[PDB]
Design a protein around this nucleic acid. Structure first.
Ligand code: MN
Ligand code: MN
Lengths: 297, 298
DNA sequence: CTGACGTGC
DNA sequence: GCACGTCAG
DNA sequence: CTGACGTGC
DNA sequence: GCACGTCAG
């Protein structure tokens, strides 16, 4: 009728498809509401290198509602990708699209480089055991209850564009053994506080029911999912075991080997590795000698 | 590809149409993001009465994401309609739908019955001078700059369902003189804090540019409105003048005549006027003597 | 006009 | 616990 | 792997 | 001020 003569207000929440992920953008907060990615063992292999990528505004987002690097730099918060670059080694285009700020939230540096990175590495590990893995990640601004029962949502906004800093990050993991497998699906929802987290807390300490997360986020995840199909807790069908300090430090050092462009850096890697722990079994020396061998050329 | 194998997440932000308004619901905050209404002379006349209406959850909203009266009662916040009941005198069906909690936000009681009430009455007043008036209303949670330069958004959530309490309320007013007139349209955008305001601040003190409001709300208002055509500031073409204390009080006293159930309550309405040294006009006096004659036969 | 609150089925 | 009469800004 | 930071034109 | 080498979790 005449009510829509000049159109309904636009919220800009429609799904946006990229090479290897999709997202819904929150124009008021300058961050994604959710970012959906599909992981398989083929996608996490390849020569795509993030050194040739740089954060930038998503051109498909109206500049009025876009975040800009000026909002993050100097803010005290790191640019935290929801769809990580590590899941897009198969395509330079796919990886570069993860560096769109439409995929980024203000994230604690330690959290970004530590616990959240470890969760991301677990999702990649799942592809060694499940043919297909679906992951939805996004930010949350949860309330905190005072001693008198009053509940308050408090979160910082940074930059000229007031980019919302989430209090928590969520991750919903859906895994299917194989296309023909009559085995149940594995499902897990996790909510992590946007702060430094050590190596003591297991991932199950941050596990929540999907229903609780849907009430906290206002989102319905995987709506096409058959509610009577056998779905099991991913931490019962699998391990939900993140890497401990020793494995984590070794994996970082191994990745640093493959990128060592000089021999002097190769020595620094070993010095950092060896102190204050770690003798590499089964595997860091085999790749250390190989890179040392080639670099002599 | 297999990316959408089980469907994309659902935000539930699609426009929902009712008899005389439309809204987009915020499932995470349990309040509407925006509520659009169209006002005309005909729509604000009629016999529809609030006494036949009750606040209830919107049946079209998934209960998982719905607010409930239990969230509001005893919270210290009033239920504040975005599309007001006063704009739906023409239809009891349309008025009942404004009491769906999908149209409601937690609102300061004084602001709700005072300053915001007066802005709504100005929107109805505009139909005396414009054939058609469109109004978009909704909540805002704006940041506050702290002493250390940090910018913090901070708002309360109330009830078992964590209904978000907005820090501000916005209203965008679009007015067209006539369907055939070549006169530019009149546009105004306003942001009012969710607190008691009083009669000192003029409405223009709360005016903002449409682009500022869109930047703050993350919404694009009236996307089919030709913004490159000449559009006039409504406070320049019109008055943007809310009722002052005397007019407001006299208008409330007039409405209260109709609802007085006793001769003692009707006379107190006249007493509070004269005790405030407000002079009753003729329509009030005539309406007052009519009701008084009819109440002394109880 | 805008609302909440106490009473009684 | 709602429906409804009462009371306030 | 995840990132920021210091330096140079 | 960005581009890029260097550095840190
Ligand atoms: Mn990250
Ligand atoms: Mn109201």
């Amino acid at each position: 009728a005449v009510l829509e003569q000049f159109g309904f207000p636009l919220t800009g929440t429609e799904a946006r498809c990229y090479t290897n992920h999709a997202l819904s953008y929150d124009q008021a907060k300058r961050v994604p509401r959710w970012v959906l990615e599909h992981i398989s063992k083929s996608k996490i292999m390849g020569d795509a290198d993030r050194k040739h990528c740089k954060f930038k505004p998503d051109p498909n987002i109206p500049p009025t509602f876009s975040a800009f690097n000026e909002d993050y730099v100097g803010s005290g918060w790191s640019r935290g990708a929801m769809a990580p670059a590590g899941n897009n080694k198969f395509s330079s285009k796919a990886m570069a699209e993860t560096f769109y700020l439409s995929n980024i939230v203000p994230q604690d540096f330690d959290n970004n480089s530590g616990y959240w990175n470890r969760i991301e590495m677990y999702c990649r590990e799942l592809t060694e055991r499940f043919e297909d893995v679906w992951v939805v990640s996004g930010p949350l601004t949860l309330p905190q209850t005072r001693g008198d029962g009053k509940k308050i949502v408090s979160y910082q906004v940074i930059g000229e564009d007031n980019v919302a800093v989430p209090s928590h990050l969520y991750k919903v993991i859906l895994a299917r053994r194989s296309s023909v497998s009559t085995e149940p699906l594995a499902l897990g929802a996790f909510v992590v506080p946007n702060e430094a987290i050590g190596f003591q807390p297991q991932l199950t300490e941050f596990q929540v029911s999907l229903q609780d997360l849907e009430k906290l986020s206002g989102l319905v995840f995987f709506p096409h999912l058959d509610r009577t199909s056998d779905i099991r807790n991913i931490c019962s069908v699998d391990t939900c075991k993140l890497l401990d300090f020793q494995e984590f430090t070794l994996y970082l050092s191994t990745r640093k080997i493959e990128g060592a462009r000089s021999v002097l850096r190769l020595e620094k890697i070993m010095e950092n590795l060896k102190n204050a722990e770690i003798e590499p079994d089964d595997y860091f020396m085999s790749r250390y000698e190989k890179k040392l061998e080639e670099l002599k050329a």
